[PDB]
């Protein structure tokens, strides 16, 4: 392997040969939504997350979506959030048998149910309309919500460092 500054979530899963943990799921969600919110503000077009290969985790803890007011366009925020929600659940389910299901903490399960529009605060949360809505739910996972920006960067920084050693050195 050769050392670089980003790995895809697909590569991360392949290297681990196991699913991501719950804290990593919250972190990728928060960090990727932050990147997407900023990209939209700078008028880069929205597009959907088609697969885990498109999600890039960086050395400094950033998470971005690789390339292919603006409130309405050919790709709405909720569509991007849905596609991200589905990919995050696949990452949490990675390698499990079809007849097994992971027992997620209720607030993480709820976040994902609402991201993915699979819903059929203790019963149901307000519908997610924006990247900021998702980020606020991830911040709420923490006892002190103002810790979120630093915390979720630190989570992805560690995930990168840990998998980069497998990337560089696994044969």
């Amino acid at each position: 392997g050769s050392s670089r500054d980003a790995l895809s979530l697909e590569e991360i899963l392949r290297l681990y040969n196991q699913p991501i943990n719950e804290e990593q799921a919250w972190a990728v969600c928060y960090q990727c939504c932050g990147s997407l919110r900023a990209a939209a503000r700078r008028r880069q077009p929205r597009h959907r997350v088609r697969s885990a290969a498109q999600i890039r985790v960086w050395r400094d803890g950033a998470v971005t979506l690789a390339p292919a007011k603006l409130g309405y366009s050919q790709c709405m925020e909720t569509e991007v959030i849905e596609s991200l929600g589905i990919i995050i659940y696949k990452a949490l389910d990675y390698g499990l048998k079809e007849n097994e299901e992971r027992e997620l903490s209720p607030p993480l399960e709820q976040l994902i149910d609402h991201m993915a529009n699979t819903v059929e605060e203790k019963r149901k949360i307000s519908a997610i309309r924006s990247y900021r809505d998702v980020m606020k739910l991830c911040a709420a996972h923490l006892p002190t919500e103002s810790d979120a920006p630093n915390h979720y960067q630190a989570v992805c920084r560690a995930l990168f460092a840990e998998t980069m050693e497998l990337h560089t050195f696994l044969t």
Binding site: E98, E103, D113
Partner: peptide, 21 residues
């Protein structure tokens, strides 16, 4: 890290997400 798993429920989140592929 997966650790804790249950049997797949017929109406649960895994069930619903699988049908969106």
């Amino acid at each position: 890290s997966l650790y804790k798993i249950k049997p797949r429920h017929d109406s649960g989140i895994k069930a619903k997400i699988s049908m969106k592929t």
